[PDB]
Design a protein around this nucleic acid. Structure first.
Length: 59
RNA sequence: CUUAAAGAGUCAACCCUUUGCUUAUCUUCCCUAUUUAAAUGUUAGCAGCCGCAUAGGCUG
């Protein structure tokens, strides 16, 4: 699948630095998005100096 | 307010059987245990006889 080919011989960094094309850089980055959901995830408090931040640790 | 917050692992059982660790052995020679000295500590608390005494006295 795409997971094997993008992960050997540093192929994801090769598409990321555009040795195989800038329009491919676009295709890669079109899939590289940040989708967010905080349900069923741990939510802890970390001290940031006179206050706390709710950190949601993702692996 | 801690990768916070939350959670039933349950069940079941035939390890079997078999067997030759035998064989032969020099332990061995050696040689100073020597010398003293208070048993003291009263070292015994007896035998009769005068008596109701297992109270108290006397006799040696």
């Amino acid at each position: 699948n795409l997971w094997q080919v993008l992960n050997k011989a540093n192929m994801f960094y090769r598409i990321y630095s555009g040795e195989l094309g800038e329009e491919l850089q676009y295709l890669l980055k079109s899939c590289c998005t940040a989708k967010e959901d905080v349900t069923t995830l741990p939510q802890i408090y970390f001290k940031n100096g006179e206050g706390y931040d709710i950190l949601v640790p993702i692996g």
